[PDB]
Amino acid sequence: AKKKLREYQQRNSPGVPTGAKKKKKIKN
Amino acid sequence: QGTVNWSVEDIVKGINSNNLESQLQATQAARKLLSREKQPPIDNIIRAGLIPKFVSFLGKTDCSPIQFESAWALTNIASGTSEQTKAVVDGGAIPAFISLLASPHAHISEQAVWALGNIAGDGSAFRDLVIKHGAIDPLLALLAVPDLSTLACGYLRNLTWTLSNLCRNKNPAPPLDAVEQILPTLVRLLHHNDPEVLADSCWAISYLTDGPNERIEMVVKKGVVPQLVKLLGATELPIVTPALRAIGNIVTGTDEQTQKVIDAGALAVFPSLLTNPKTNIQKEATWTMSNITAGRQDQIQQVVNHGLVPFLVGVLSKADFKTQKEAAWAITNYTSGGTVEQIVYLVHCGIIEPLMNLLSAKDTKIIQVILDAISNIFQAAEKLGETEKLSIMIEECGGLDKIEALQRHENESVYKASLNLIEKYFS
Numbered sequence: 191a192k193k194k195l196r197e198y199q200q201r202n203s204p205g206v207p208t209g210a211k212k213k214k215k216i217k218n
Numbered sequence: 219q220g221t222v223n224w225s226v227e228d229i230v231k232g233i234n235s236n237n238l239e240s241q242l243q244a245t246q247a248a249r250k251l252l253s254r255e256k257q258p259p260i261d262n263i264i265r266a267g268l269i270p271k272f273v274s275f276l277g278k279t280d281c282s283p284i285q286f287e288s289a290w291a292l293t294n295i296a297s298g299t300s301e302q303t304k305a306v307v308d309g310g311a312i313p314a315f316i317s318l319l320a321s322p323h324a325h326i327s328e329q330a331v332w333a334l335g336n337i338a339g340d341g342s343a344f345r346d347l348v349i350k351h352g353a354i355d356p357l358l359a360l361l362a363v364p365d366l367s368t369l370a371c372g373y374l375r376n377l378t379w380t381l382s383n384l385c386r387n388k389n390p391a392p393p394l395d396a397v398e399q400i401l402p403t404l405v406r407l408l409h410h411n412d413p414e415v416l417a418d419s420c421w422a423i424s425y426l427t428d429g430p431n432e433r434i435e436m437v438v439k440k441g442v443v444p445q446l447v448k449l450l451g452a453t454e455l456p457i458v459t460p461a462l463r464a465i466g467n468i469v470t471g472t473d474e475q476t477q478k479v480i481d482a483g484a485l486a487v488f489p490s491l492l493t494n495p496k497t498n499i500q501k502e503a504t505w506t507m508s509n510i511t512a513g514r515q516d517q518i519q520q521v522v523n524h525g526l527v528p529f530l531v532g533v534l535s536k537a538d539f540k541t542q543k544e545a546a547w548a549i550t551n552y553t554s555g556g557t558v559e560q561i562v563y564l565v566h567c568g569i570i571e572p573l574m575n576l577l578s579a580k581d582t583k584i585i586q587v588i589l590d591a592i593s594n595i596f597q598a599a600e601k602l603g604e605t606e607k608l609s610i611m612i613e614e615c616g617g618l619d620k621i622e623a624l625q626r627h628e629n630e631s632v633y634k635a636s637l638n639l640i641e642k643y644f645s
Binding site: 207210214 | 255297
């Protein structure tokens with residue numbers, strides 16, 4: 191059977207990469 | 219020097235002053251306070267009661283600079299904790315930012331795009347609340363141009379990033395009709411040549427394919443799989459990482475959805491992906507392989523033809539320990555679905571000895587995975603009589619010691635497989 195990304199990253203994350211959730215604006 | 223480091227007390231005195239120009243200066247001073255990188259006093263700004271004032275300034279249509287300054291200030295409060303984002307939302311910022319998307323000042327619209335990205339980014343409830351307030355139509359209208367290249371780079375990146383947060387989280391996944399609304403312009407962003415737009419478009423696609431098979435199908439039927447495979451071979455690591463995550467998500471679906479990934483040519487990129495020096499790429503590429511070797515025999519055969527079995531032997535032999543697991547899974551699923559000829563081919567590529575070496579690990583879950591695989595391999599060699607040759611291989615590389623030392627293990631599954639293995643093939 192196939193293991194979805196939640197079962198994948200259950201014995202892997204924290205540490206699995208993702209895009210930026212929130213972004214602070216520091217320059218113009 | 220005018221608005222450099224105001225005290226919160228001065229900002230408050232200016233914002234409460236009944237002089238719109240005094241309020242603008244105080245709001246800019248608040249924005250600069252909130253923009254510094256050493257611990258900006260978000261909570262002090264919240265406690266002073268400034269958010270309702272900032273939200274009110276969003277509607278000052280005839281003072282466009284105070285719209286920008288308060289938009290920027292609120293953007294940076296919304297960039298903090300859930301509690302801080304919630305303070306912005308409770309001030310009614312969401313409908314005021316959506317009204318700003320249509321502003322004739324591109325820098326003000328862009329700032330409303332950004333603030334909505336931070337709010338939607340906090341989680342699925344605020345994500346769906348941004349959607350209920352009607353943000354998707356004005357966001358997508360800003361991308362309704364004949365050619366995205368005529369838009370400013372930062373503007374386009376900001377729209378892409380915010381759309382990807384509207385695609386993002388999972389309990390629950392975004393509304394189906396909202397996903398359908400966004401996908402066509404997302405497909406378009408996936409063909410734009412800017413590294414950051416591409417990376418965030420791949421992230422969006424990765425979110426959308428992380429769920430049940432009906433969600434994978436929504437994406438796959440838009441035809442993006444070949445473009446994802448192309449992006450998979452990018453030199454930019456910020457692109458291959460989400461591109462690979464999306465591909466890996468898609469091959470968790472049906473055999474048919476997996477086949478489009480194979481049809482698209484994805485297996486030719488895996489020699490470099492399974493040897494990639496970034497260990498996360500190599501972990502996710504091996505996980506992706508384990509869901510392909512869980513496919514049909516014709517799909518396992520395509521893995522063989524592309525020469526990927528020596529690459530799995532390599533990852534099993536030497537890799538990050540977590541990566542070696544994924545390779546163990548890839549092997550056990552291969553052994554589960556493959557023909558006998560495909561299974562004995564594993565032995566010809568050298569799978570046995572790196573499997574035995576990994577029996578020395580402490581993670582109980584793999585002794586299971588590994589012992590299952592050697593069980594399946596013994597079972598397939600038996601249908602050609604080659605049981606002895608395999609038993610001496612396992613004996614010569616010190617794997618026999620591991621298998622029998624293992625039926626004094628604290629697990630029913632471990633030591634009933636251990637001791638089973640010994641009786642039919644080691645006596």
